[PDB]
Amino acid sequence: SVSIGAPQIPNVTWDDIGGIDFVKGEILDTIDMPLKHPELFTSGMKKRSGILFYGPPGTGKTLMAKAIATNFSLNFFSVKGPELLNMYIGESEANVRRVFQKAREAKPCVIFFDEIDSVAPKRGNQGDSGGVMDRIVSQLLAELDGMSTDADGVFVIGATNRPDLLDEALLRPGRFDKLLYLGIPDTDTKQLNILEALTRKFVLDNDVK
Amino acid sequence: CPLRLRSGILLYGYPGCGKTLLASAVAQQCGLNFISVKGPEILNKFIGASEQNIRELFERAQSVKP
Amino acid sequence: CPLRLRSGILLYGYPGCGKTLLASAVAQQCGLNFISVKGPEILNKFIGASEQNIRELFERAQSVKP
Ligand SMILES: Nc1ncnc2c1ncn2[C@@H]1O[C@H](COP(=O)(O)OP(=O)(O)OP(=O)(O)O)[C@@H](O)[C@H]1O
Numbered sequence: 597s598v599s600i601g602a603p604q605i606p607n608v609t610w611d612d613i614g615g616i617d618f619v620k621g622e623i624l625d626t627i628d629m630p631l632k633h634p635e636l637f638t639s640g641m642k643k644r645s646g647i648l649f650y651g652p653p654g655t656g657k658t659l660m661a662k663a664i665a666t667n668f669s670l671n672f673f674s675v676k677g678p679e680l681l682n683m684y685i686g687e688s689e690a691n692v693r694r695v696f697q698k699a700r701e702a703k704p705c706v707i708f709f710d711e712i713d714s715v716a717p718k719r720g721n722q723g724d725s726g727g728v729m730d731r732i733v734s735q736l737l738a739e740l741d742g743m744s745t746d747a748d749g750v751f752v753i754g755a756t757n758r759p760d761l762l763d764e765a766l767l768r769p770g771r772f773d774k775l776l777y778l779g780i781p782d783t784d785t786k787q788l789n790i791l792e793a794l795t796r797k798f799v800l801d802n803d804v805k
Numbered sequence: 806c807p808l809r810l811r812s813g814i815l816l817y818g819y820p821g822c823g824k825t826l827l828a829s830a831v832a833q834q835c836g837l838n839f840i841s842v843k844g845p846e847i848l849n850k851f852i853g854a855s856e857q858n859i860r861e862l863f864e865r866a867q868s869v870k871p
Numbered sequence: 872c873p874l875r876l877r878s879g880i881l882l883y884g885y886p887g888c889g890k891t892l893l894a895s896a897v898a899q900q901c902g903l904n905f906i907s908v909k910g911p912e913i914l915n916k917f918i919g920a921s922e923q924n925i926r927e928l929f930e931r932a933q934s935v936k937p
């Protein structure tokens with residue numbers, strides 16, 4: 597990765613975050629089940645497009661993605677939506693194409709777009725001032741749609757806070773199939789696990805209950 | 806027939822209805838040069854290359870068999 | 872300390888309430904590399920440039936001591 601770039605993974609693991617009880621099965625099936633069972637799964641059928649998060653902000657979505665990348669140790673790159681946009685159209689599309697193709701060179705790998713909302717909105721809804729995004733989003737679509745044909749070992753993950761503005765072309769399975777969620781913990785057990793993970797490293801006095 | 810045959814037809818319909826596949830697949834069935842193109846690949850930030858990009862695509866197309 | 876320490880803090884109050892003076896003074900009171908930037912200066916009518924300037928300012932920040 598260093599030769600290729602992104603060392604992003606600082607430090608994370610399952611113990612470092614709670615509330616993963618229900619999602620664990622789905623994410624693990626989407627990620628490692630093919631890894632542990634690739635040849636068996638070699639039936640030339642549609643692989644799971646990827647993952648898509650949403651919900652209240654600060655719900656650990658980005659931490660969750662980093663934990664996935666670290667625990668399963670697949671080549672990772674973080675794409676900050678606004679960093680892509682250039683002064684005029686086109687060169688942003690070139691940036692998207694080059695990043696995706698270099699990822700397709702480094703296989704198998706994991707790719708995640710941070711705050712997809714700001715680079716994959718519903719074009720037309722907001723006042724189209726320049727129509728710049730219309731074309732960038734177009735990029736992602738086909739390169740997402742062109743992933744399954746050959747790019748095996750690469751899967752997409754998305755983080756959102758206002759998913760009501762996402763362009764619908766993405767939501768289709770093949771483009772996006774698992775619309776995973778991470779929101780407020782409902783039952784006291786959720787916060788209990790999240791807290792024991794939160795204070796896992798604390799040097800606490802026994803008074804802590 | 807001294808008539809130019811119908812060769813350009815547009816595809817549209819419900820999103821994710823399969824048009825992408827059928828487009829890719831028909832190449833092998835009929836058997837031809839399917840020079841696929843990515844929309845954003847043509848448009849170039851810089852003038853003097855977009856028209857050049859489409860022109861080069863067309864020169865590729867003709868320079869190969871039908 | 873196993874937890875990342877609260878790093879960023881915002882300021883907000885009455886106009887001309889010395890917020891600028893406090894920000895200027897904290898540079899010497901503690902003693903560090905005081906990276907300074909205004910509001911409009913980052914924004915430029917060239918798209919990309921507005922986010923690009925803040926990104927490279929953060930690159931500069933990562934370049935030096937705290
Ligand atoms: N068990 C936990 N689950 C989730 N977040 C936790 C947990 N314990 C602590 N946190 C805190 O919650 C925050 C998670 O924010 P995170 O970086 O994941 O942003 P995000 O919600 O993905 O961002 P955005 O919604 O702005 O796109 C951090 O401040 C983290 O310390």
Ligand SMILES: Nc1ncnc2c1ncn2[C@@H]1O[C@H](COP(=O)(O)OP(=O)(O)OP(=O)(O)O)[C@@H](O)[C@H]1O
Pocket residue numbers: 741765770818819820821822823824825826827
């Ligand atoms: N009879 C069928 N023939 C072909 N594909 C079918 C059929 N029934 C269902 N499908 C499925 O429809 C899906 C639609 O995918 P595809 O990307 O080709 O759609 P599309 O409508 O052309 O969308 P887009 O314009 O966004 O590329 C295909 O993945 C295919 O598996």
